[PDB]
């Protein structure tokens, strides 16, 4: 759909959050005024991972979720309000539906979605 | 101020568009999904202008206003309201205290107010 | 496998070339004095874009294969003399088979093969 | 005067940067084949800022001048050897005079030459 696309990262777990930093800190020093906000990301994302990888730091936010359903319903409330230019879900399974959803909410609040499946 | 820049170009008015062609088709074709608004424009950047600077758009707006004052107006309504990444203004003279009006109206809409001195 | 990542990317052509940008470009502007060398890349990544990009192309070897067998091939080629950190492939499909090869190439050259799916 | 035109950035050191490397971009990849050439630019622009804006590095010269004086002297015969396209400066001041001697230098060359004022 529009205003979605998933990048998927399969090999060594510690290997797949190296190639995803430079993402991820791609997204967050870019020329926006508006935050990329990271919903219910995995474990590995330490406190220390992202400044470690370099956080834009003062310009990402990092909500938590419990049910990879209270995350899509966040995801779609993050994009909607339109005050994230990104907002990166981690989302699995995703059906075609719930893409539909964040896509749309991504067009209101003119942002991007993101889904990042790991592993 | 902060969210406030100016941009003056001196020098054949030709040049001068010539110059500023690149900005607009960068700001344009940039990552945050909002438009680019242009505020009370020059004569200059006609509807043949845009396409040859070949700028994209479908993501660029054109408004109009009749006063240097009206424009000041605009341009922070457009800064407001946030659906746009960058409002470039074209306003002269501009206050300190305008300056200010645009930079907090740029703030709030979480957008970057630009405004252009030709000639 | 070991030594092997996959990155996959889905939504707009365009869109997923600038995903990939930031990725490739730490990738070339490493430490690793070796060679970060890109295998049978799509039509895309123009001699433009990977300047637009802000590669390094100081640092890059872009070979050329004509088949999605004989891109399997270089790519463990490039690997296997391990004169380069990383090797970029974009071949699919990719067999269980060809992973493995790829992996083994990537360990006698003591370096990195990441596949890369586009669309 | 003709041949000459002056480009001011105010706001965010950074962000004046960014509103420079689309035009500087252009002006690199102009189709006159012949040099475009930087002179006494400021730190900012460094070895890795030109790169990551996307110049075709190729393409620049990047000369050093160590007095605002000696720059002055050195844009002017960049000029008016003819072989640069577009000779760039930033200086400041820059007299009445001055702009006449860029300007003459500019003609004879059939170049241009544009000044920059950054902050």
Redesign the interface.
């Known amino acids: 759909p529009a205003?979605?696309?998933?990048?998927?990262?399969?090999?060594?777990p510690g290997?797949?959050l190296t190639?995803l930093?430079?993402?991820l800190?791609?997204l967050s020093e870019?020329?926006?005024?508006?935050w990329l906000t990271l919903i219910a990301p995995p474990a590995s994302l330490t406190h220390e991972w992202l400044r470690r990888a370099g956080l834009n730091r003062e310009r990402i936010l990092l909500l938590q979720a419990k049910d990879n359903a209270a995350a899509l319903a966040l995801s779609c409330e993050a994009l909607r309000l339109?005050?994230s230019?990104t907002v990166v879900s981690w989302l699995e399974p995703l059906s075609r539906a719930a893409r539909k959803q964040l896509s749309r909410a991504?067009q209101l609040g003119?942002?991007?979605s993101?889904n990042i499946r790991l592993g």
Chains 1, 2, 3, 4 share one sequence.
């Open positions: 205003a979605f696309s998933e990048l998927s990262l399969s090999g060594l290997h797949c190639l930093a430079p993402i800190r791609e870019e020329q926006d005024a508006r339109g005050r230019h991504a003119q942002a991007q993101l």
